Amino acid sequence: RFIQWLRNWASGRDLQAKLQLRYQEISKRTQPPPKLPVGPSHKLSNNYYCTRDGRREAMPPSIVMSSSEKKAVSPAPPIKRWELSQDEPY
Amino acid sequence: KFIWTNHKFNLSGTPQQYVPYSTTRKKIQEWVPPSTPY
Amino acid sequence: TRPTVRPRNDVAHKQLSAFGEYVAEILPKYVQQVQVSCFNELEICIHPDGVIPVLTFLRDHSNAQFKSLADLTAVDIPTRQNRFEIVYNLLSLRFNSRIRVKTYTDELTPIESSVPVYKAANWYEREIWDMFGVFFANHPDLRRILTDYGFEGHPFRKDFPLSGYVELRYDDEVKRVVAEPVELAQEFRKFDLNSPWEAFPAYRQPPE
Amino acid sequence: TYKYVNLREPSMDMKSVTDRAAQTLLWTELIRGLGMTLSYLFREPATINYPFEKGPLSPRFRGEHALRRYPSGEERCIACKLCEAVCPAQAITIEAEPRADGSRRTTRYDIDMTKCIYCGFCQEACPVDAIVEGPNFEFSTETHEELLYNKEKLLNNGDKWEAEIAANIQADYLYR
Amino acid sequence: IPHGKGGRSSVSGIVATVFGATGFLGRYVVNHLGRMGSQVIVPHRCEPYDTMHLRPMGDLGQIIFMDWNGRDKDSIRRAVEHSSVVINLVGREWETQNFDFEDVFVKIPQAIAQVSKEAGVEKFIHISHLNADIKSSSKYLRSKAVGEKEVRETFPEATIIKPAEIFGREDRFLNYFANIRWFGGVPLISLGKKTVKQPVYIVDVTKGIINAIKDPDARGKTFAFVGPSRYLLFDLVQYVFAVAHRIGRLFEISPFEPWTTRDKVERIHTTDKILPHLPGLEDLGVEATPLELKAIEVLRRHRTYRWLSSEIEDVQPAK
Amino acid sequence: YRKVRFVGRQKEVNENFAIDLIAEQPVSQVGSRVISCDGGGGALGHPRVYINLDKETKTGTCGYCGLQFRQ
Amino acid sequence: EYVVAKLDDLINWARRSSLWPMTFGLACCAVEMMHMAAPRYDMDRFGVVFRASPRQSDVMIVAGTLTNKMAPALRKVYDQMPEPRYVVSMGSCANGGGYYHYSYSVVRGCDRIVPVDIYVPGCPPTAEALLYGILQLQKKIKREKRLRIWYR
Amino acid sequence: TSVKPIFSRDMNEAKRRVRELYRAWYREVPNTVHLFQLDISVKQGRDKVREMFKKNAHITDPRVVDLLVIKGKMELEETIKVWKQRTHVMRFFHETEAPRPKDFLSKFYVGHDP
Numbered sequence A: 001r002f003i004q005w006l007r008n009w010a011s012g013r014d015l016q017a018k019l020q021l022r023y024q025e026i027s028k029r030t031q032p033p034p035k036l037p038v039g040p041s042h043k044l045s046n047n048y049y050c051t052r053d054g055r056r057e058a059m060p061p062s063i064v065m066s067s068s069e070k071k072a073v074s075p076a077p078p079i080k081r082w083e084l085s086q087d088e089p090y
Numbered sequence B: 001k002f003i004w005t006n007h008k009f010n011l012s013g014t015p016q017q018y019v020p021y022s023t024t025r026k027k028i029q030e031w032v033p034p035s036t037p038y
Numbered sequence C: 001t002r003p004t005v006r007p008r009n010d011v012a013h014k015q016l017s018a019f020g021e022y023v024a025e026i027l028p029k030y031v032q033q034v035q036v037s038c039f040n041e042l043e044i045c046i047h048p049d050g051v052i053p054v055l056t057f058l059r060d061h062s063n064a065q066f067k068s069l070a071d072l073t074a075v076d077i078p079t080r081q082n083r084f085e086i087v088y089n090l091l092s093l094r095f096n097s098r099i100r101v102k103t104y105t106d107e108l109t110p111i112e113s114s115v116p117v118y119k120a121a122n123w124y125e126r127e128i129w130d131m132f133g134v135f136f137a138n139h140p141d142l143r144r145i146l147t148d149y150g151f152e153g154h155p156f157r158k159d160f161p162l163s164g165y166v167e168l169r170y171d172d173e174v175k176r177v178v179a180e181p182v183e184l185a186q187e188f189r190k191f192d193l194n195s196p197w198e199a200f201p202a203y204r205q206p207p208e
Numbered sequence D: 001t002y003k004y005v006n007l008r009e010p011s012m013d014m015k016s017v018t019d020r021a022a023q024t025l026l027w028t029e030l031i032r033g034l035g036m037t038l039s040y041l042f043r044e045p046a047t048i049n050y051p052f053e054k055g056p057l058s059p060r061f062r063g064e065h066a067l068r069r070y071p072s073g074e075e076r077c078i079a080c081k082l083c084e085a086v087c088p089a090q091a092i093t094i095e096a097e098p099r100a101d102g103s104r105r106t107t108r109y110d111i112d113m114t115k116c117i118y119c120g121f122c123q124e125a126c127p128v129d130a131i132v133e134g135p136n137f138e139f140s141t142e143t144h145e146e147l148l149y150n151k152e153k154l155l156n157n158g159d160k161w162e163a164e165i166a167a168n169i170q171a172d173y174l175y176r
Numbered sequence E: 001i002p003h004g005k006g007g008r009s010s011v012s013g014i015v016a017t018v019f020g021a022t023g024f025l026g027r028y029v030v031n032h033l034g035r036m037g038s039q040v041i042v043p044h045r046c047e048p049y050d051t052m053h054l055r056p057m058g059d060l061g062q063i064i065f066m067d068w069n070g071r072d073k074d075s076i077r078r079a080v081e082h083s084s085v086v087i088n089l090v091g092r093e094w095e096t097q098n099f100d101f102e103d104v105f106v107k108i109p110q111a112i113a114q115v116s117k118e119a120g121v122e123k124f125i126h127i128s129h130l131n132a133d134i135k136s137s138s139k140y141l142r143s144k145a146v147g148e149k150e151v152r153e154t155f156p157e158a159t160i161i162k163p164a165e166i167f168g169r170e171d172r173f174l175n176y177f178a179n180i181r182w183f184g185g186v187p188l189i190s191l192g193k194k195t196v197k198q199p200v201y202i203v204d205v206t207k208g209i210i211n212a213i214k215d216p217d218a219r220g221k222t223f224a225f226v227g228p229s230r231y232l233l234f235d236l237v238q239y240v241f242a243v244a245h246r247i248g249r250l251f252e253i254s255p256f257e258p259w260t261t262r263d264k265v266e267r268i269h270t271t272d273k274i275l276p277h278l279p280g281l282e283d284l285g286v287e288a289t290p291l292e293l294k295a296i297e298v299l300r301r302h303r304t305y306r307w308l309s310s311e312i313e314d315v316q317p318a319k
Numbered sequence F: 001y002r003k004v005r006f007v008g009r010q011k012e013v014n015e016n017f018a019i020d021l022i023a024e025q026p027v028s029q030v031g032s033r034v035i036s037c038d039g040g041g042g043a044l045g046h047p048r049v050y051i052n053l054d055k056e057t058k059t060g061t062c063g064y065c066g067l068q069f070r071q
Numbered sequence G: 001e002y003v004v005a006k007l008d009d010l011i012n013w014a015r016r017s018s019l020w021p022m023t024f025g026l027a028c029c030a031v032e033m034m035h036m037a038a039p040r041y042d043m044d045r046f047g048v049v050f051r052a053s054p055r056q057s058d059v060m061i062v063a064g065t066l067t068n069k070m071a072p073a074l075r076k077v078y079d080q081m082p083e084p085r086y087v088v089s090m091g092s093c094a095n096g097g098g099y100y101h102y103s104y105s106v107v108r109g110c111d112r113i114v115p116v117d118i119y120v121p122g123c124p125p126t127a128e129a130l131l132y133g134i135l136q137l138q139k140k141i142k143r144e145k146r147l148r149i150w151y152r
Numbered sequence H: 001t002s003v004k005p006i007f008s009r010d011m012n013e014a015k016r017r018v019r020e021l022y023r024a025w026y027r028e029v030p031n032t033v034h035l036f037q038l039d040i041s042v043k044q045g046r047d048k049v050r051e052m053f054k055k056n057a058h059i060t061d062p063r064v065v066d067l068l069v070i071k072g073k074m075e076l077e078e079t080i081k082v083w084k085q086r087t088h089v090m091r092f093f094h095e096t097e098a099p100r101p102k103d104f105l106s107k108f109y110v111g112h113d114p
């Protein structure tokens, strides 16, 4: 009609992606009962606390404090640069 | 059961605004003096 | 142990042993302790004398850059006999690392501003004067930020009862908004959560 | 990696520079969008016409409080003093004292409705599964003498709809 | 029984009631009971919204409102039944087109001197005026000195009060002047003779009550309220132009709330300083407040900045 | 003294009372020794607790549940 | 005689049907005010046009948290408003202060500073129990300016 | 005690200092008293200043007497300018607050165990 392409005379054209989704193509509801699995070492006869151990780990290891061919060691290697990452990088 | 029949509202003064109160038993239970005789 | 326990990495912990070995080597007039946090971070315990000095060495060098100052802060500990604490925190852009610099103090002893070394300690030093009470000398400006114009208590230290000492309320008897002592409508209940048995053996305090 | 934006140079030749002098002086741009991309009004408005129509929600929503009771009623709350002790804001206030038979229940239960920050920490600590955030935004009365709740305001406010509540949990309780 | 400290959210054991307590005086008393702790039951007549500017006065659950008429003998009996002290400021200026004004100082102060006496109030209180004398004056000033006679019969314990001409903040006494931009200031009556009265500052009166509110030991024994020094001059009407550098109304406007070409003009010049033997103030003290210093505040006009005020007064004589 | 606050406000109070609403229950029986008290339906109700009724005539309703229970 | 009480079906229907609310953005609650003037629930054009200058308003609104240093500012602004003014707080922090109610630098409650009328309760009230809180205030004018002139 | 003092050295330059900024206060009370459009007897404004400076009298030490100053040196920034709106100032002179008994027998009838 005469108002359909006058919406298409600007901003290119869409007619597929449209702001209000109001029409169909949505998700309906939660129909199914789900079941959430428990995997991670949940079983018996083996899983034994004191091998899984999340916590109980030591105090911060010291270094020489009060009471040699050094290369001027830096804390780590310096950073190598980045690419220019072809996408349309200009 | 144990739920209503019709309904109510959130009303500003209905007259009933419910204006809450305290729900508890008394506290220190003051002493009563003795009666008429000396 | 693997599935739920955070996998460690050694390499990061070898170097930050070295590179921190020798900044107790080349500035021994100042640095009084150094160590390695088990997560691969460093803490340099420095006398209050060097503050402008040490950073300035950390300010430029070809073996340690540390140009980016991230976080200045404080902690205030009673029963440390010198109350407060500073912690500077600096990122060296080239070498990808964090090295924190701890310097103690008191209220009365001044500490000297870091402002000519970095211009980003401009605010972070105005603040602390409000909260804890530490007084930074030779600071281009010293004023009141984060707080109202009335608080004479310097709150975040450990003696300020949470609700401050004056509630506020407006009355129409004249035309101001005036200040009457604090009167609450609920106690602020104090619960008590600290459970016995000392679940941590590794941190076990000295036997005594 | 990287990218470089706003790094370009004009071409500098008389086939181009007309195209940039047919732009400044004739306004061939600046009518491109707002001569057009504005209109483009011909789309259906999006409005939820409020007093009648209303918008979406989910079964996990949070809101006005309740206290359920089983079939023939027990006042499901046992006064175990938990939904009180995880409360960040410290709204809750509970005072038990042994009821006549000897089963324990409450006396005062008061949720302040100003302090409550709407966690979802008091829906999730109750082991006997009593106290439940309702899905109705009925609120807004005209006096702060009010919103403080007692016990016997809550129960009704939670027996006014239990057809709403008792059908949400049985969607949601299979996940947690 | 009094607990704790008198700041706010405290007790201090006294209930009260204050009738009236909307216009100038009553608003300014309750504000001194919304601090030391109380239970101030303030009723009011017709005004739903004019009473709000009051509410941030008591902390929470202290002051509480009712509705009443006052010619119904029940409306005063439903409230007071629980009370300790009850004062009464009620009454006003000009005769109403509805209330005939004759007994509103007679029947009303008695209508609340009904079951209050019966029901077991105590330390009941009422107001008088320094200038009201049962000799012939003044048509409004009269009927007020009847209450001192007629009403005192009931409730042998009163400690009924007798203050002077008062100057507040929003008050209408000293404000009738300086509203007088007009064909000119014409004193009353074009004579500089008997001005002025004892102009006590509204704080001291409203600090008197709450000083007698549990005094103790003033009941039946009436007091009168000293002014500052000393009497005063004509200059008071010049003093107005010395510094000034020259509820439930309506939607649009009213029909009559005038300057009243009636008692009003002659009520201000009635002077009659009266008996010293009344205790009457420092005993109930400790308060007395001047004029020269406290009259800038309440007076602010179209300069709003300049003051530079050096001019004072002796007393003046008869002093 | 306190009682002048709800004047005209109609004083919300609880029409029903559970102080005892319990005793109207047909106190059950089993014919066995110890029982499972999980109430009000599975996984909505008190945690499972097992009570012993051997007295003569009594029971024990676990005290979460309240509902009069015995053999 | 009866003309007055029929007149207040005009003036007491005019002031309730056009409101010019000020707002205070301060804290989280401001965003769930905006969405009242966004098109979903459309505040304006249901009779209430949104923010104007301090002088022209009727109903000011307090969002957010009121520290010490903001109290001297509010009190002043509430004054200048014309006569037919109200104060409708909202959010759990104008009612007794959300949390922060035990802090040092937060005024406790914002009723203490002004004579507040209607309340609303919760971090952000859900952009609904806002409007539900106004359709209280357009129903909280049942009052009559009759029976002050015309009784006493 | 060995720590560097702040400004003063012992008690004299110090007690030259407190004498000093007194006048900056004493010379400027009143320019404000017309500026905020607050009304008081200008002599009050010269009583409080002299009421405060006499308050902390027992101070035995430098670096305390310098500490207090650094507060006092500030305020003249805000007040001599306008960073306060009438209600950060007048709070010095407490108008509304009902009196404290401070005597004995006036306590014993009001309040428990102070």
Ligand SMILES: NC(=O)c1ccc[n+]([C@@H]2O[C@H](COP(=O)([O-])OP(=O)(O)OC[C@H]3O[C@@H](n4cnc5c(N)ncnc54)[C@H](OP(=O)(O)O)[C@@H]3O)[C@@H](O)[C@H]2O)c1
Residues within 6 Å of the ligand: E020, E021, E022, E023, E024, E025, E026, E045, E046, E047, E069, E070, E089, E090, E091, E092, E093, E104, E108, E127, E128, E129, E163, E164, E165, E166, E247, E248, G152
């Ligand atoms: N002590 C003094 O210096 C002095 C000076 C002048 C006059 N007075 C008298 O002492 C008291 C001071 O009054 P004021 O300064 O506050 O001025 P006011 O304008 O008379 O205040 C009285 C308030 O109570 C209301 N009122 C009038 N008659 C009433 C009645 N029978 N019952 C209930 N309310 C009534 C008035 O109108 P509404 O009914 O609408 O509330 C007004 O709201 C008054 O009795 C006054 O006549 C004293």
Ligand code: SF4
Residues within 6 Å of the ligand: D076, D077, D078, D079, D080, D081, D082, D083, D084, D125, D126, D127, D128, D129, D130, D131
């Ligand atoms: S509901 Fe859960 S938490 Fe709240 S009281 Fe009853 S038991 Fe204790």
Ligand code: SF4
Residues within 6 Å of the ligand: D086, D087, D088, D089, D090, D091, D092, D115, D116, D117, D118, D119, D120, D121, D122, D123
């Ligand atoms: S609702 Fe949120 S805030 Fe109110 S109690 Fe439960 S958790 Fe604490």
Ligand code: SF4
Residues within 6 Å of the ligand: G027, G028, G029, G030, G063, G064, G065, G091, G092, G093, G094, G098, G099, G122, G123, G124, G125
């Ligand atoms: S919760 Fe407290 S902070 Fe978050 S919005 Fe409501 S009021 Fe502002």
